Amino acid sequence: ECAPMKNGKVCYSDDVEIENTSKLEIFNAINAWAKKSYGKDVFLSNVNSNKNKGTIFVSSKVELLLNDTDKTIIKYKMRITCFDNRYTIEASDIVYQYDPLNDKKYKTYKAEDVIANNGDSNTIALIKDPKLFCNATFFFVENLFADVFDAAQNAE
After folding, report:
1. Based on the structure, what is the number of domains in the chain?
2. By the 8 A CB rule, do 66 and 129 touch?
3. CATH number of the domain where residue 156 is located
4. Distance between CA 134 and CA 117 in Å, rounded?
5. How many Å apart are CA 61 and CA 40, to the nearest integer?
6. Where in the sequence is the domain holding 117, given as residue range(s)?
7. Which positions fall inside the DUF4468 domain (predicted)?
8. Taking the CA of residue 146 as centre, how many other CA atoms within 13 Å lie in the half-sphere pointing to its CB?
9. What are phi and psi of 144, to 5 degrees?
10. Cα 34 from chain centre
11. Neighbours of 127 (CB within 10 A)
């Protein structure tokens, strides 16, 4: 459930039909959301909008709440590809920057080394709560997908 994997990496994806709606309309609706959401977070996020290819690439780094005590930085990339009546979305290259004392002494962990097999295959002895990382990541990414879906529905 929470840590879908493909070709050895954590990868979340969706594929969405938008009936009778052109590539341009879909692209412009999703591009607006990406530019608003990630364009003036200049130190922490990057966006490339490729109108030639109908693709939007996003890179971001954000604090992710784990429970009440704990939290991690999460870094991720996302690619949205627009077609007539259809778009695809993938989020991968997931990496954690984490300090269990929550004092900014981060160490970098690939998601594959923490949340594989829904947190049951954690390799990092120092992470005592890997299913929290798995669950938090699933809800974070999937809600981004839902934001994208809502933006896409704005096309005509």
Report:
1. 1
2. yes
3. 3.30.530.80
4. 9
5. 14
6. 1-156
7. 12-97
8. 6
9. -65, -40
10. 12
11. 22
